[PDB]
Design a protein around this ligand. Sequence first.
Ligand SMILES: Cc1ccc(C(=O)NC2CC2)cc1NC(=O)c1ccc(-c2ccccc2Cl)s1
Length: 338
Amino acid sequence: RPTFYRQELNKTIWEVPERYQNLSPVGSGAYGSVCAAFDTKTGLRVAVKKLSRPFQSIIHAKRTYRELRLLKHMKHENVIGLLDVFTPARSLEEFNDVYLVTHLMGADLNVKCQKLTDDHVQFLIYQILRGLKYIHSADIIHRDLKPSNLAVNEDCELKILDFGLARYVATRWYRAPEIMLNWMHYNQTVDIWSVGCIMAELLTGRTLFPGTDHIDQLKLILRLVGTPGAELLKKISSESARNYIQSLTQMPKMNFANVFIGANPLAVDLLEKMLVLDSDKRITAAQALAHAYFAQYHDPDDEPVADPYDQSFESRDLLIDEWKSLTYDEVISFVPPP
Ligand SMILES: Cc1ccc(C(=O)NC2CC2)cc1NC(=O)c1ccc(-c2ccccc2Cl)s1
């Protein structure tokens, strides 16, 4: 067992191995606070997250297990990877805290100075889609993809954070309209809608759909893509969602070439394919990687998929101590990457 040391950060005690030095709070992460740290074993700058009350509720205990299982499985260059997982607990009976360690990277994609050049956008979006192809192949979706959960280093290398966890006092600028309207006729291309929103913002320097509330958000989306057509309306099972759509003014679809003036025509074409209201017609991550916009980056021989991922726990209703014991087993069996 390594030697641990205690300190107070964010009005709570952090107890970590001596290996992690100079803990500095860098704000909140998903379900916990994150500290930047120096890993003395590897010489790498890392992000250490202390999960908040991981086993103090059934929802928390199951999400703790969900997150650790996800992190232990996902092994891809454009997907955040688990460098370490630890607990100061010496036994299952004392197991109450979970800490997770990943690369820090340095910044996220989220005040703005300027637009990004076309090659910079190609590289960033390519990396996002390459990471999404991998995540989606494990039957995992982000569901809350946005600039703040895209971690980038000084060389513009990118890793997706906080996927597989999500399922009106906040802006939902990158959310697919089908998740917002609870249709709930949706698939993995909800993340492709978010990619489209991000790409558009990187190219123009402006938020594509900066809705002031849930109502205004949909209004801005429909102003660009047009109101749902007859083919799409037929596929909506929800009476509540269908009623909402009809109550809105009929908007024509805008030609994106007139919205993204001066942009690479191939970027405009890809945006048209990503920002389709009908999720059955929206481009997939794998299809988007093959689009001519990424000709300089695309390599079909190096866009890997995930190994089969056992997610059967998702259907289970277990007690807090059962989720805790399963999580503990995962912590003790963890093998760090080379
Ligand atoms: C430490 C950690 C643990 C789990 C997950 C995660 O993605 N979990 C779900 C997949 C299952 C992400 C992180 N990293 C982080 O949360 C951060 C890395 C870099 C961060 C950062 C901090 C400050 C400023 C900019 C950045 Cl990118 S935050």
